[PDB]
Amino acid sequence: QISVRGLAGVENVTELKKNFNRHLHFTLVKDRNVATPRDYYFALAHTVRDHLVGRWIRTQQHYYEKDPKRIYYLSLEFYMGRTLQNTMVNLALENACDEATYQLGLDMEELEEIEEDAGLGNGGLGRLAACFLDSMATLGLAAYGYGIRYEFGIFNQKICGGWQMEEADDWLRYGNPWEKARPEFTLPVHFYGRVEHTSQGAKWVDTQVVLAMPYDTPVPGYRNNVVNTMRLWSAKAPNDFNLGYIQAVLDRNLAENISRVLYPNDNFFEGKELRLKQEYFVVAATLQDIIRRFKSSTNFDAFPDKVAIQLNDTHPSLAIPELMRVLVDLERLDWDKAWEVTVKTCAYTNHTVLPEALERWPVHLLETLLPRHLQIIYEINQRFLNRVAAAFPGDVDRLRRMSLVEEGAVKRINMAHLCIAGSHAVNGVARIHSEILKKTIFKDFYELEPHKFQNKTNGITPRRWLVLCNPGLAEIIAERIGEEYISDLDQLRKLLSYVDDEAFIRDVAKVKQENKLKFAAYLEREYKVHINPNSLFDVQVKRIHEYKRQLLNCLHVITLYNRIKKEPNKFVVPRTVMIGGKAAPGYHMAKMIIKLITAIGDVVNHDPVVGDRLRVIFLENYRVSLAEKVIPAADLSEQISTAGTEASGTGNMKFMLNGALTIGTMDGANVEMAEEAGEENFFIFGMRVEDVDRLDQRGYNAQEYYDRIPELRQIIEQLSSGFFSPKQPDLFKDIVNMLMHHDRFKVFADYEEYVKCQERVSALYKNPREWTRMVIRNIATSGKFSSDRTIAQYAREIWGVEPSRQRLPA
Amino acid sequence: QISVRGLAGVENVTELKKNFNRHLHFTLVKDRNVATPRDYYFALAHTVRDHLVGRWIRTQQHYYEKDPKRIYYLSLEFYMGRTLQNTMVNLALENACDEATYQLGLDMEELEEIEEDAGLGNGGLGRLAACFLDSMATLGLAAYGYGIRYEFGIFNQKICGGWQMEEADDWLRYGNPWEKARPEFTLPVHFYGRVEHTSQGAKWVDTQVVLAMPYDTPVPGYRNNVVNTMRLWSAKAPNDFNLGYIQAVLDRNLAENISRVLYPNDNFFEGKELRLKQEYFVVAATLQDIIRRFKSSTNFDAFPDKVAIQLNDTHPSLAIPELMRVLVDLERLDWDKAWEVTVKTCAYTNHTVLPEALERWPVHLLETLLPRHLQIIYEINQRFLNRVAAAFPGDVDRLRRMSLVEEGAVKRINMAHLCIAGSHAVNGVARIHSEILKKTIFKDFYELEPHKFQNKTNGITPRRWLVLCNPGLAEIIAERIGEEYISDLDQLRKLLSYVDDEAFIRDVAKVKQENKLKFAAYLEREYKVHINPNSLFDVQVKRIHEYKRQLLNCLHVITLYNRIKKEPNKFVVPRTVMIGGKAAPGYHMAKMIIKLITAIGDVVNHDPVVGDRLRVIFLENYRVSLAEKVIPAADLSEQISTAGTEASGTGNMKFMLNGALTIGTMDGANVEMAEEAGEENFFIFGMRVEDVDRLDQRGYNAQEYYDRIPELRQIIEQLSSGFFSPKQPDLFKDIVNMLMHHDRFKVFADYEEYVKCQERVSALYKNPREWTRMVIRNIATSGKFSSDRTIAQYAREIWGVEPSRQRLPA
Numbered sequence A, B: 001q002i003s004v005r006g007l008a009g010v011e012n013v014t015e016l017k018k019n020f021n022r023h024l025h026f027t028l029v030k031d032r033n034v035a036t037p038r039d040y041y042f043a044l045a046h047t048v049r050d051h052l053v054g055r056w057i058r059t060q061q062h063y064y065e066k067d068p069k070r071i072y073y074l075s076l077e078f079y080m081g082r083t084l085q086n087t088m089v090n091l092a093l094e095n096a097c098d099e100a101t102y103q104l105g106l107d108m109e110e111l112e113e114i115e116e117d118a119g120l121g122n123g124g125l126g127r128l129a130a131c132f133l134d135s136m137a138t139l140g141l142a143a144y145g146y147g148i149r150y151e152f153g154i155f156n157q158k159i160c161g162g163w164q165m166e167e168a169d170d171w172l173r174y175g176n177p178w179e180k181a182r183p184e185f186t187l188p189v190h191f192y193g194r195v196e197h198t199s200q201g202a203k204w205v206d207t208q209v210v211l212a213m214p215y216d217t218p219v220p221g222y223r224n225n226v227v228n229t230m231r232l233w234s235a236k237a238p239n240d241f242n243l244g245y246i247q248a249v250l251d252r253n254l255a256e257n258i259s260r261v262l263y264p265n266d267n268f269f270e271g272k273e274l275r276l277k278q279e280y281f282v283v284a285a286t287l288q289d290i291i292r293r294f295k296s297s298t299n300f301d302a303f304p305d306k307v308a309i310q311l312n313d314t315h316p317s318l319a320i321p322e323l324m325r326v327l328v329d330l331e332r333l334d335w336d337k338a339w340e341v342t343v344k345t346c347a348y349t350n351h352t353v354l355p356e357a358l359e360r361w362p363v364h365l366l367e368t369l370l371p372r373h374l375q376i377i378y379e380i381n382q383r384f385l386n387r388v389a390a391a392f393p394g395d396v397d398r399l400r401r402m403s404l405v406e407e408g409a410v411k412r413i414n415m416a417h418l419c420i421a422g423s424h425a426v427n428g429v430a431r432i433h434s435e436i437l438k439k440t441i442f443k444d445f446y447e448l449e450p451h452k453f454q455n456k457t458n459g460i461t462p463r464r465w466l467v468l469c470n471p472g473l474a475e476i477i478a479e480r481i482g483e484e485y486i487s488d489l490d491q492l493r494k495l496l497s498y499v500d501d502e503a504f505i506r507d508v509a510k511v512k513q514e515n516k517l518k519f520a521a522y523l524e525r526e527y528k529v530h531i532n533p534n535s536l537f538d539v540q541v542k543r544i545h546e547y548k549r550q551l552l553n554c555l556h557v558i559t560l561y562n563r564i565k566k567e568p569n570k571f572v573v574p575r576t577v578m579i580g581g582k583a584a585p586g587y588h589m590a591k592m593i594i595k596l597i598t599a600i601g602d603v604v605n606h607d608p609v610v611g612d613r614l615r616v617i618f619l620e621n622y623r624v625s626l627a628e629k630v631i632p633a634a635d636l637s638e639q640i641s642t643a644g645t646e647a648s649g650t651g652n653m654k655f656m657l658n659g660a661l662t663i664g665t666m667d668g669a670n671v672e673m674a675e676e677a678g679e680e681n682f683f684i685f686g687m688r689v690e691d692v693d694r695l696d697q698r699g700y701n702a703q704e705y706y707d708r709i710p711e712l713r714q715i716i717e718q719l720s721s722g723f724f725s726p727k728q729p730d731l732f733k734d735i736v737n738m739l740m741h742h743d744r745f746k747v748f749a750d751y752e753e754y755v756k757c758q759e760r761v762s763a764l765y766k767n768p769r770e771w772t773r774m775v776i777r778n779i780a781t782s783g784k785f786s787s788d789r790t791i792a793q794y795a796r797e798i799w800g801v802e803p804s805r806q807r808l809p810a
């Protein structure tokens, strides 16, 4: 049908049809009389998977023969989403499969909707890991993703009476055709026990054993015949575990609980023992696998020449003391040599500066669970502080600030300090964030070892986030500049030559309009909600958090409502304001924000004076599959975190690539997006980082803004008085109290500038030709935000390997 | 190679090789450089499974079109063993697969050894269910086996220091290629709650829900292209289950524990709540499935014309009140009509008279767990006792004896009484057992409803228990009388014509000798034990229980030892005495018996004066796969239960078919085996049932036997004094005390006759020609003990359906 989806040759289509019928009969054990749409989805998935296998085997054979340096990306989260369409895109099978299924009387898009998201992450950090895997395969790197196979991923969100309810995400219920269990590479992981010191070094004894069983998932590169591996570990009890009899068998669940469920926090740390077990479990199994693969090519001097370990935040930070344990206790290397190898092997990426997100584990937990690792951590600390004292003699306060061990009521280990000490490279995830790291929280470390500190601005894969989710846009671009941009996104700059082209302007606006109609129809059928598809689609989708300031958006929505009610017969640009995202189950204020958003919708959407001029919709169960639908439909992207809080953002980049304009603060990657597009082509507002600092120095007083801005005072009085909660008048008093007295994120301080900037958005939307010209300038300059660029920088500047765009044989 | 294994045609072999390589590559994702023997096993299993699929689909389609009466065999146990070889046998693929694998450089017998037993039963009852499934498919019956998919089957037995240790049987660890999950036919099962009485009848409300997810396994008939289904239910929590957040997800294990583990008792009842949940779980899911299938052809008058439900003991007895619940509470039938339908639909097989094996559930458990079922049980009881009172007016004691409700400290429901009341047929499992039921424990019921009581003597499948495990014997029989006997075992009578044939005598003895050599080599390699393969192989394999009298065998072994020590230079016929079987984990005396057997071996096997004249071997981890190896190797089958205690036995029949002679009491099916072969061709000894009764009337005094038999006194003094436990002299005092003062099974009363009868065995073994002639007379008359005969009788006399030997199209 469309060119970027590849060829539908008669021979390919015939073969796909034959294998589909083979899998329906032999694999699923159905005939066409009893088969459901789900059976048809599975038959297609097995058909497509068969095309990966030869390439997967050949890729792994190739790495064995060439023995390149191997890159191990360790993460507690991989937010993969669906795999069927992405696999077809990367193997150039999409049109052939569409034709094959059409000839069998089936609609492939309907079959795609059956697949569950692999929701093994919370949001941006887990999704970044998924984009990175895609880019590493596309760049021909010998890369392995290692994590945990959670039985239950991020919870499914239901809204009941306007409140979030959580339900278990039983994503494996129908089976996962993409994974292959490898019970033959099962490895032991140790917990508890105690340390004995013999004359032959330290020995960790009397431990409890849990088995780590790997499941492998293929990761195809873009049309290069490279298929890399994501290896996820699942916890299994040994067979003599606890071995009255019946209870001993039932108690196997205690060991197997390690891989049961993803902790559903975003930017928040809880010191729970089960989470620490998860972190060690991934690290211990992974490092044994790495070492086994290294030995099958003891001279550990070459280890950092053949192995790079990238730590995705501090979550796998125990890799540092585990690597030391193995090298010193088991391989019998002297400490100094082991440390040299460790530092050269490991690199650490930081993803947040919020103090409540930083992992600081109580010493008593580590002492009980991982007594040998605690001893190694203390020794690391003592040697590290000896270096600090030599470089800054007499600076006693610096020693306290830089210690891996934090003193207090409860002694804790600062895992970020451990990662810096034990890594040859430390990076932030956008330029402003990397600078903030060097100037504030890691300033002392930067002064000691400036060479370690780098920036690697985040990116997104253009396969999933353009070609897959927005084929209409991909096609009209390809008609002008060919297909090479899909793996070389900088080529989108060529579109600046079409900014005055009437045909291109029309085609860009036509694609957006089609995407909006499609999304409006999706809403009506799956959620019984009607929207005006001529309205401006104003979209804020991301996890619910005070720092992301969904509350600032709520204040703007109420402002627009109140202005309409004041002058009902004045023209205003119609908007559909859509907000979605999950709240962590224990985060009360985040749950209250969801309730406020739905309560505003309840009033606004049923006021006959408003008409279809303003609609407020809470998008339920925001996840990767929903992002693929709503992002192509958006006109305005809301990226409105308080300056200094969003380390990068990646949703921002997805919206830019898909033809939305951005309203945002100078935070995270927004800064770089504005720099690339030109500030004139971005809706920038609000305090910069320096302005936030100045306000903190004199003290933030929310009352001053309340006193000076009548429109703001009216909103607070409405919230307090029960205007949005007539049955429960005090329902929102905690929100009001936080905004007035305890607001860490300064919502009121950016209110005036935000509202004025929103008026400019509305003014531009009235002139569709100029709106679309600005859009073209954004899409055209989005090339920097390809994860292929990000990964090439990690490869050259951290890992010491060269990317390749060369194809392996087919 | 051998004819009974079928044809190896060039085209078939070529196709098998091609599909094996396809599964290795696409299904297992291996190449031949990295593949292990386990990978080769899986590639073969998937290759063979593909040949079942077409037949499975076509069989189920055929039943849909013809709509025959359907037979539902409900069991808490299906002891299936391995499936690969049995599937090849039933599809006539064995020689083709052997040739195909040989050409690929692989040994098929080595691949067969990799497969795990499906150990979803304890012993004879579960194995009977498996033989029955095989026979029902071979006889073309529209039959379904329904049970539970236990995650852990019967424990693996290890012997450590001569003691049984148990380890979990993690049989699903590597996957099960034979099953197909059917998550689409998942059904709800209810627990707890309470009963409300409206004007619109009773309603069971406020229940906890567990989901029952079915897994289907094919059951192929013998060369008839029929493939029936075994459907096993697995427990799953609903997704809103308990829905802080993390704990709620972890607590899903509480619901899923229902299908976690098989209770490992044989002939012993424990009133544990988890076991009651298992029993209801199977019944509730199964009955909904049955009713759904019946509606897809509400006139329940035809239900018993289209449905038969066979209850395998009382374990699924809740089917009776559940069927009543559904018909009365949900379908709104009047009680009397519902009861008529229930009784005509259900039939009950009793498998034991031991009082400690009978299920008697406390009323307080049923009241809490299944409050509506308890109400229905009381109503059944009141109506049943009203009939008893009308038939036997004034017989107040009969009313108490026959009640479903037993009075006492704790009120209980007698489940056997419930099954009799609610079934149109009640059967025992061998003639003597069926007679004992009518004369003793169910005498009152027999007097009320004599027409209900039947016998169905047990049987074994000759596919698994001759063709599969003993191909050499199958072949030499087939050379003389053709292949029809495999599905018509009565044709073995034709072998009586070859009792004087010197060639046949030689061939029978040659096959036994080959089987013995093969087993002796198996012992040496897997267990480091050396045996004399010219010795008489004296074998007792079955679960360890006081009623089975492994202790009587131990006394004979010690007697032989003591006689050798007394006259070391006298000739005695050499024996290898092999005893194996599992003890239930809580059954102390059974565990002590295992220890005694290994302790006797420790003394006997290392005494240089004994030489290779006597060896005592405990066979570890006795299970279906081990039975297939040892039974073909046996010379003497020990079937020595106290008369009146072994309801039938089925091991006895396996030994008879495979060319062992039997030493046994007149118990269970032994009676009928002796009748078929002639008493002159059996080694019968000991008390008959009537003699046991006479001894009970005057009182069993073990001291009398001790006082009168010097050889017996010597053994007891050796046990007591620490002769067999020199480091722990009192180790066996509980065994001695039980034998002398508390022996319910009268071991001493049969000692003298047993020893004398064993001397006659030895005398005959010295004359190999006459030994083999007697063997031929046993094999030749074993035809009655085919489970095909048993199933044909159930079909005609209970279920009301006609067996068919006709082939479905290929």
Ligand SMILES: OC[C@H]1O[C@@H](c2nnc(-c3ccc(-c4ccccc4)cc3)[nH]2)[C@H](O)[C@@H](O)[C@@H]1O
Residues within 6 Å of the ligand: A122, A124, A125, A128, A263, A264, A265, A266, A267, A268, A269, A270, A275, A351, A352, A357, A429, A458, A646, A647, A648, A649, A650, A668
């Ligand atoms: O670089 C990718 C993205 O990482 C996000 C992040 N930064 N920290 C986390 C984070 C922290 C903790 C946990 C967590 C989860 C479970 C248990 C404990 C901690 C999850 C995510 N996520 C940042 O907020 C984004 O600005 C950034 O674009």
Ligand SMILES: OC[C@H]1O[C@@H](c2nnc(-c3ccc(-c4ccccc4)cc3)[nH]2)[C@H](O)[C@@H](O)[C@@H]1O
Residues within 6 Å of the ligand: B122, B124, B125, B128, B263, B264, B265, B266, B267, B268, B269, B270, B275, B351, B352, B357, B429, B458, B646, B647, B648, B649, B650, B668
């Ligand atoms: O007909 C097939 C076989 O059934 C056996 C049996 N009779 N009862 C049981 C039995 C009873 C209870 C349980 C049980 C298991 C777990 C939990 C509770 C009870 C298991 C088996 N097994 C008899 O002992 C054999 O003589 C007979 O050949």
Ligand SMILES: *Cc1c(COP(=O)(O)O)cnc(C)c1O
Residues within 6 Å of the ligand: A122, A123, A124, A127, A541, A542, A543, A622, A623, A624, A627, A648, A649, A650, A651, A652, A654
């Ligand atoms: C990209 C993405 C995120 C991250 O969005 P931000 O706006 O950068 O927080 C979160 N969740 C999902 C499902 C995503 O696809």
Ligand SMILES: *Cc1c(COP(=O)(O)O)cnc(C)c1O
Residues within 6 Å of the ligand: B122, B123, B124, B127, B541, B542, B543, B622, B623, B624, B627, B648, B649, B650, B651, B652, B654
């Ligand atoms: C046949 C069989 C049994 C039953 O043997 P009995 O001697 O009748 O108790 C028990 N276990 C296994 C593994 C069997 O094959």
